[PDB]
PDB file of all heavy atoms in Angstrom:
ATOM      1  N   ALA E 199     -38.031 -57.311   2.042  1.00  2.00           N
ATOM      2  CA  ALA E 199     -38.575 -58.161   3.080  1.00  2.00           C
ATOM      3  C   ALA E 199     -40.062 -58.344   2.929  1.00  2.00           C
ATOM      4  O   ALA E 199     -40.566 -59.419   3.216  1.00  2.00           O
ATOM      5  CB  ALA E 199     -38.287 -57.556   4.416  1.00  2.00           C
ATOM      6  N   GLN E 200     -40.791 -57.319   2.499  1.00  2.00           N
ATOM      7  CA  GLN E 200     -42.217 -57.520   2.237  1.00  2.00           C
ATOM      8  C   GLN E 200     -42.455 -58.458   1.066  1.00  2.00           C
ATOM      9  O   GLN E 200     -43.366 -59.279   1.108  1.00  2.00           O
ATOM     10  CB  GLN E 200     -42.899 -56.222   1.906  1.00  2.00           C
ATOM     11  CG  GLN E 200     -43.153 -55.284   2.986  1.00  2.00           C
ATOM     12  CD  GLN E 200     -43.970 -54.148   2.484  1.00  2.00           C
ATOM     13  OE1 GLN E 200     -44.401 -54.152   1.355  1.00  2.00           O
ATOM     14  NE2 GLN E 200     -44.164 -53.154   3.302  1.00  2.00           N
ATOM     15  N   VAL E 201     -41.696 -58.308  -0.014  1.00  2.00           N
ATOM     16  CA  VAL E 201     -41.841 -59.193  -1.165  1.00  2.00           C
ATOM     17  C   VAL E 201     -41.425 -60.604  -0.802  1.00  2.00           C
ATOM     18  O   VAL E 201     -42.043 -61.576  -1.228  1.00  2.00           O
ATOM     19  CB  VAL E 201     -41.037 -58.650  -2.346  1.00  2.00           C
ATOM     20  CG1 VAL E 201     -41.178 -59.496  -3.482  1.00  2.00           C
ATOM     21  CG2 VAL E 201     -41.524 -57.382  -2.711  1.00  2.00           C
ATOM     22  N   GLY E 202     -40.398 -60.749   0.017  1.00  2.00           N
ATOM     23  CA  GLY E 202     -40.043 -62.058   0.510  1.00  2.00           C
ATOM     24  C   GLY E 202     -41.083 -62.660   1.408  1.00  2.00           C
ATOM     25  O   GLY E 202     -41.254 -63.870   1.413  1.00  2.00           O
ATOM     26  N   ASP E 203     -41.783 -61.834   2.187  1.00  2.00           N
ATOM     27  CA  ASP E 203     -42.872 -62.319   3.024  1.00  2.00           C
ATOM     28  C   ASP E 203     -44.045 -62.789   2.199  1.00  2.00           C
ATOM     29  O   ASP E 203     -44.679 -63.774   2.554  1.00  2.00           O
ATOM     30  CB  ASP E 203     -43.323 -61.264   4.007  1.00  2.00           C
ATOM     31  CG  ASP E 203     -42.338 -61.052   5.141  1.00  2.00           C
ATOM     32  OD1 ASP E 203     -41.326 -61.765   5.198  1.00  2.00           O
ATOM     33  OD2 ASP E 203     -42.563 -60.167   5.993  1.00  2.00           O
ATOM     34  N   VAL E 204     -44.420 -62.053   1.158  1.00  2.00           N
ATOM     35  CA  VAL E 204     -45.521 -62.489   0.302  1.00  2.00           C
ATOM     36  C   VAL E 204     -45.152 -63.760  -0.444  1.00  2.00           C
ATOM     37  O   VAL E 204     -45.969 -64.662  -0.597  1.00  2.00           O
ATOM     38  CB  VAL E 204     -45.912 -61.381  -0.677  1.00  2.00           C
ATOM     39  CG1 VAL E 204     -46.977 -61.847  -1.579  1.00  2.00           C
ATOM     40  CG2 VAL E 204     -46.368 -60.203   0.041  1.00  2.00           C
ATOM     41  N   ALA E 205     -43.912 -63.868  -0.903  1.00  2.00           N
ATOM     42  CA  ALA E 205     -43.462 -65.090  -1.546  1.00  2.00           C
ATOM     43  C   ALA E 205     -43.456 -66.249  -0.582  1.00  2.00           C
ATOM     44  O   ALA E 205     -43.777 -67.369  -0.955  1.00  2.00           O
ATOM     45  CB  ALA E 205     -42.085 -64.877  -2.124  1.00  2.00           C
ATOM     46  N   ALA E 206     -43.034 -66.007   0.646  1.00  2.00           N
ATOM     47  CA  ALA E 206     -43.090 -66.999   1.701  1.00  2.00           C
ATOM     48  C   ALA E 206     -44.496 -67.486   1.909  1.00  2.00           C
ATOM     49  O   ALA E 206     -44.714 -68.676   2.060  1.00  2.00           O
ATOM     50  CB  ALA E 206     -42.544 -66.410   2.980  1.00  2.00           C
ATOM     51  N   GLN E 207     -45.438 -66.567   2.049  1.00  2.00           N
ATOM     52  CA  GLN E 207     -46.851 -66.896   2.165  1.00  2.00           C
ATOM     53  C   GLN E 207     -47.349 -67.764   1.020  1.00  2.00           C
ATOM     54  O   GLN E 207     -48.117 -68.699   1.231  1.00  2.00           O
ATOM     55  CB  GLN E 207     -47.640 -65.625   2.240  1.00  2.00           C
ATOM     56  CG  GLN E 207     -49.040 -65.862   2.495  1.00  2.00           C
ATOM     57  CD  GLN E 207     -49.774 -64.598   2.717  1.00  2.00           C
ATOM     58  OE1 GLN E 207     -49.185 -63.525   2.761  1.00  2.00           O
ATOM     59  NE2 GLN E 207     -51.076 -64.704   2.883  1.00  2.00           N
ATOM     60  N   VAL E 208     -46.979 -67.432  -0.212  1.00  2.00           N
ATOM     61  CA  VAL E 208     -47.406 -68.214  -1.373  1.00  2.00           C
ATOM     62  C   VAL E 208     -46.804 -69.612  -1.357  1.00  2.00           C
ATOM     63  O   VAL E 208     -47.473 -70.593  -1.676  1.00  2.00           O
ATOM     64  CB  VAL E 208     -47.019 -67.448  -2.639  1.00  2.00           C
ATOM     65  CG1 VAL E 208     -47.290 -68.214  -3.773  1.00  2.00           C
ATOM     66  CG2 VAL E 208     -47.807 -66.236  -2.755  1.00  2.00           C
ATOM     67  N   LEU E 209     -45.595 -69.754  -0.854  1.00  2.00           N
ATOM     68  CA  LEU E 209     -44.984 -71.063  -0.779  1.00  2.00           C
ATOM     69  C   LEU E 209     -45.529 -71.862   0.368  1.00  2.00           C
ATOM     70  O   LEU E 209     -45.615 -73.084   0.270  1.00  2.00           O
ATOM     71  CB  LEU E 209     -43.488 -70.935  -0.613  1.00  2.00           C
ATOM     72  CG  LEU E 209     -42.774 -70.332  -1.783  1.00  2.00           C
ATOM     73  CD1 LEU E 209     -41.378 -70.126  -1.441  1.00  2.00           C
ATOM     74  CD2 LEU E 209     -42.864 -71.335  -2.814  1.00  2.00           C
ATOM     75  N   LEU E 210     -46.052 -71.200   1.375  1.00  2.00           N
ATOM     76  CA  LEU E 210     -46.600 -71.947   2.473  1.00  2.00           C
ATOM     77  C   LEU E 210     -48.029 -72.302   2.223  1.00  2.00           C
ATOM     78  O   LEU E 210     -48.442 -73.380   2.627  1.00  2.00           O
ATOM     79  CB  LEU E 210     -46.551 -71.131   3.748  1.00  2.00           C
ATOM     80  CG  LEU E 210     -45.240 -70.865   4.418  1.00  2.00           C
ATOM     81  CD1 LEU E 210     -45.354 -69.627   5.138  1.00  2.00           C
ATOM     82  CD2 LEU E 210     -45.017 -71.890   5.364  1.00  2.00           C
ATOM     83  N   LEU E 211     -48.705 -71.571   1.356  1.00  2.00           N
ATOM     84  CA  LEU E 211     -50.075 -71.916   1.030  1.00  2.00           C
ATOM     85  C   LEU E 211     -50.114 -72.973  -0.033  1.00  2.00           C
ATOM     86  O   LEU E 211     -50.959 -73.858   0.008  1.00  2.00           O
ATOM     87  CB  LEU E 211     -50.797 -70.708   0.506  1.00  2.00           C
ATOM     88  CG  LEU E 211     -51.349 -69.715   1.472  1.00  2.00           C
ATOM     89  CD1 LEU E 211     -51.673 -68.499   0.699  1.00  2.00           C
ATOM     90  CD2 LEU E 211     -52.504 -70.295   2.117  1.00  2.00           C
ATOM     91  N   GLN E 212     -49.122 -72.987  -0.896  1.00  2.00           N
ATOM     92  CA  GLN E 212     -49.047 -74.024  -1.898  1.00  2.00           C
ATOM     93  C   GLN E 212     -48.544 -75.310  -1.298  1.00  2.00           C
ATOM     94  O   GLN E 212     -49.039 -76.372  -1.644  1.00  2.00           O
ATOM     95  CB  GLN E 212     -48.145 -73.577  -3.026  1.00  2.00           C
ATOM     96  CG  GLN E 212     -48.405 -74.278  -4.273  1.00  2.00           C
ATOM     97  CD  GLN E 212     -47.196 -74.375  -5.100  1.00  2.00           C
ATOM     98  OE1 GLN E 212     -46.111 -74.478  -4.594  1.00  2.00           O
ATOM     99  NE2 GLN E 212     -47.374 -74.398  -6.387  1.00  2.00           N
ATOM    100  N   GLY E 213     -47.593 -75.245  -0.371  1.00  2.00           N
ATOM    101  CA  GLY E 213     -47.142 -76.458   0.266  1.00  2.00           C
ATOM    102  C   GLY E 213     -48.201 -77.077   1.139  1.00  2.00           C
ATOM    103  O   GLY E 213     -48.364 -78.291   1.142  1.00  2.00           O
ATOM    104  N   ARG E 214     -48.902 -76.266   1.922  1.00  2.00           N
ATOM    105  CA  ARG E 214     -49.971 -76.796   2.741  1.00  2.00           C
ATOM    106  C   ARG E 214     -51.089 -77.385   1.906  1.00  2.00           C
ATOM    107  O   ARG E 214     -51.636 -78.411   2.283  1.00  2.00           O
ATOM    108  CB  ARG E 214     -50.488 -75.740   3.687  1.00  2.00           C
ATOM    109  CG  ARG E 214     -50.388 -76.116   5.108  1.00  2.00           C
ATOM    110  CD  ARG E 214     -51.089 -75.105   5.947  1.00  2.00           C
ATOM    111  NE  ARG E 214     -50.796 -73.703   5.699  1.00  2.00           N
ATOM    112  CZ  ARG E 214     -49.722 -73.080   6.147  1.00  2.00           C
ATOM    113  NH1 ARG E 214     -48.860 -73.711   6.896  1.00  2.00           N
ATOM    114  NH2 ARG E 214     -49.539 -71.811   5.892  1.00  2.00           N
ATOM    115  N   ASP E 215     -51.485 -76.744   0.801  1.00  2.00           N
ATOM    116  CA  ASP E 215     -52.514 -77.335  -0.054  1.00  2.00           C
ATOM    117  C   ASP E 215     -52.084 -78.654  -0.671  1.00  2.00           C
ATOM    118  O   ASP E 215     -52.876 -79.590  -0.723  1.00  2.00           O
ATOM    119  CB  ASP E 215     -52.948 -76.369  -1.119  1.00  2.00           C
ATOM    120  CG  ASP E 215     -53.846 -75.319  -0.579  1.00  2.00           C
ATOM    121  OD1 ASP E 215     -54.138 -75.379   0.629  1.00  2.00           O
ATOM    122  OD2 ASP E 215     -54.263 -74.434  -1.353  1.00  2.00           O
ATOM    123  N   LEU E 216     -50.902 -78.703  -1.272  1.00  2.00           N
ATOM    124  CA  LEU E 216     -50.394 -79.951  -1.826  1.00  2.00           C
ATOM    125  C   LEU E 216     -50.335 -81.046  -0.777  1.00  2.00           C
ATOM    126  O   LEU E 216     -50.679 -82.190  -1.057  1.00  2.00           O
ATOM    127  CB  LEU E 216     -49.015 -79.735  -2.431  1.00  2.00           C
ATOM    128  CG  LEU E 216     -48.788 -78.856  -3.641  1.00  2.00           C
ATOM    129  CD1 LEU E 216     -47.368 -78.746  -3.861  1.00  2.00           C
ATOM    130  CD2 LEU E 216     -49.398 -79.462  -4.819  1.00  2.00           C
ATOM    131  N   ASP E 217     -49.879 -80.718   0.428  1.00  2.00           N
ATOM    132  CA  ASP E 217     -49.781 -81.679   1.517  1.00  2.00           C
ATOM    133  C   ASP E 217     -51.146 -82.209   1.925  1.00  2.00           C
ATOM    134  O   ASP E 217     -51.327 -83.417   2.097  1.00  2.00           O
ATOM    135  CB  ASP E 217     -49.105 -81.016   2.692  1.00  2.00           C
ATOM    136  CG  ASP E 217     -47.606 -81.073   2.604  1.00  2.00           C
ATOM    137  OD1 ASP E 217     -47.085 -81.427   1.539  1.00  2.00           O
ATOM    138  OD2 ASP E 217     -46.928 -80.736   3.592  1.00  2.00           O
ATOM    139  N   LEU E 218     -52.104 -81.310   2.161  1.00  2.00           N
ATOM    140  CA  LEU E 218     -53.449 -81.720   2.547  1.00  2.00           C
ATOM    141  C   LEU E 218     -54.145 -82.507   1.453  1.00  2.00           C
ATOM    142  O   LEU E 218     -54.878 -83.459   1.743  1.00  2.00           O
ATOM    143  CB  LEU E 218     -54.277 -80.518   2.948  1.00  2.00           C
ATOM    144  CG  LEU E 218     -54.293 -80.017   4.385  1.00  2.00           C
ATOM    145  CD1 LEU E 218     -53.043 -79.498   4.922  1.00  2.00           C
ATOM    146  CD2 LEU E 218     -55.246 -78.912   4.404  1.00  2.00           C
ATOM    147  N   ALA E 219     -53.949 -82.125   0.196  1.00  2.00           N
ATOM    148  CA  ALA E 219     -54.527 -82.884  -0.903  1.00  2.00           C
ATOM    149  C   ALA E 219     -53.950 -84.285  -0.964  1.00  2.00           C
ATOM    150  O   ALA E 219     -54.693 -85.251  -1.114  1.00  2.00           O
ATOM    151  CB  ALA E 219     -54.310 -82.163  -2.218  1.00  2.00           C
ATOM    152  N   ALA E 220     -52.619 -84.402  -0.944  1.00  2.00           N
ATOM    153  CA  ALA E 220     -51.947 -85.697  -0.924  1.00  2.00           C
ATOM    154  C   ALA E 220     -52.404 -86.573   0.220  1.00  2.00           C
ATOM    155  O   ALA E 220     -52.531 -87.788   0.056  1.00  2.00           O
ATOM    156  CB  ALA E 220     -50.446 -85.493  -0.822  1.00  2.00           C
ATOM    157  N   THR E 221     -52.742 -85.972   1.356  1.00  2.00           N
ATOM    158  CA  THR E 221     -53.215 -86.757   2.483  1.00  2.00           C
ATOM    159  C   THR E 221     -54.601 -87.297   2.229  1.00  2.00           C
ATOM    160  O   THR E 221     -54.860 -88.473   2.496  1.00  2.00           O
ATOM    161  CB  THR E 221     -53.207 -85.936   3.745  1.00  2.00           C
ATOM    162  OG1 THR E 221     -52.002 -85.175   3.794  1.00  2.00           O
ATOM    163  CG2 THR E 221     -53.270 -86.828   4.896  1.00  2.00           C
ATOM    164  N   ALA E 222     -55.524 -86.442   1.779  1.00  2.00           N
ATOM    165  CA  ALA E 222     -56.876 -86.902   1.476  1.00  2.00           C
ATOM    166  C   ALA E 222     -56.878 -87.979   0.399  1.00  2.00           C
ATOM    167  O   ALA E 222     -57.607 -88.968   0.504  1.00  2.00           O
ATOM    168  CB  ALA E 222     -57.751 -85.741   1.053  1.00  2.00           C
ATOM    169  N   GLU E 223     -56.116 -87.770  -0.672  1.00  2.00           N
ATOM    170  CA  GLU E 223     -55.981 -88.763  -1.740  1.00  2.00           C
ATOM    171  C   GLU E 223     -55.472 -90.087  -1.203  1.00  2.00           C
ATOM    172  O   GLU E 223     -55.931 -91.148  -1.629  1.00  2.00           O
ATOM    173  CB  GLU E 223     -55.078 -88.233  -2.843  1.00  2.00           C
ATOM    174  CG  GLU E 223     -55.711 -87.063  -3.566  1.00  2.00           C
ATOM    175  CD  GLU E 223     -54.826 -86.442  -4.603  1.00  2.00           C
ATOM    176  OE1 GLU E 223     -53.633 -86.794  -4.652  1.00  2.00           O
ATOM    177  OE2 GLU E 223     -55.318 -85.566  -5.339  1.00  2.00           O
ATOM    178  N   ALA E 224     -54.454 -90.045  -0.340  1.00  2.00           N
ATOM    179  CA  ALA E 224     -53.945 -91.267   0.270  1.00  2.00           C
ATOM    180  C   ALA E 224     -55.022 -91.971   1.083  1.00  2.00           C
ATOM    181  O   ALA E 224     -55.174 -93.192   0.989  1.00  2.00           O
ATOM    182  CB  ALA E 224     -52.748 -90.941   1.151  1.00  2.00           C
ATOM    183  N   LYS E 225     -55.768 -91.212   1.896  1.00  2.00           N
ATOM    184  CA  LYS E 225     -56.830 -91.800   2.708  1.00  2.00           C
ATOM    185  C   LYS E 225     -57.909 -92.439   1.860  1.00  2.00           C
ATOM    186  O   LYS E 225     -58.492 -93.445   2.266  1.00  2.00           O
ATOM    187  CB  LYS E 225     -57.452 -90.784   3.653  1.00  2.00           C
ATOM    188  CG  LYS E 225     -56.870 -90.894   5.035  1.00  2.00           C
ATOM    189  CD  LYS E 225     -56.551 -89.573   5.710  1.00  2.00           C
ATOM    190  CE  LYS E 225     -57.681 -88.600   5.592  1.00  2.00           C
ATOM    191  NZ  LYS E 225     -57.263 -87.248   5.969  1.00  2.00           N
TER     192      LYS E 225
END
Side-chain angles (χ1 to χ4, degrees):
Chain E
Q200 286 187 5
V201 181
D203 287 357
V204 177
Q207 186 174 355
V208 174
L209 294 174
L210 289 152
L211 278 166
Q212 203 209 33
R214 239 188 312 280
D215 284 359
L216 294 174
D217 275 12
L218 271 65
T221 317
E223 293 176 350
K225 262 137 47 193

